[PDB]
Design a protein around this ligand. Sequence first.
Ligand SMILES: Cc1noc(-c2ccc(Cl)cc2NC(=O)C2=C(C(=O)O)CCC2)n1
Length: 134
Amino acid sequence: SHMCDAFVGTWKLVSSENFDDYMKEVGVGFATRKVAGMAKPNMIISVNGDVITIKSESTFKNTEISFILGQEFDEVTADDRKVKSTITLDGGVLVHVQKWDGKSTTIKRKREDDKLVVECVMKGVTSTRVYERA
Ligand SMILES: Cc1noc(-c2ccc(Cl)cc2NC(=O)C2=C(C(=O)O)CCC2)n1
């Protein structure tokens, strides 16, 4: 019933690359980076009508956002930034832009084979986090 269907489900982190550097660029402090980098979240994605919900559950923090595509919302990130976020679908990729303090970071989620690939960019730095079905 919608192309956003290939994201729905329960996903578990299986690989991370460059995440510490991404977090440094975002401005996350040492202790949060270390504990955050250890986390192995599950990502739970659901759809109800026009509302998409993404939950991240881990030993560090449980976070949840709900949103409508293209409609800005205020978000508290896991590292406690208060950001203005918009999430859109662009050619089959979920594109999440977070703005705060004159900065911006973009998080892209895409289906590739049986994985959900998360690419996180802050200025020159890209982190790639790969999830598989739980
Ligand atoms: C920045 C930043 N500072 O702390 C954190 C973070 C902290 C804890 C936990 Cl448990 C996960 C985190 N972040 C993630 O997992 C992220 C992605 C993911 O969903 O893979 C996409 C980008 C961030 N992110």
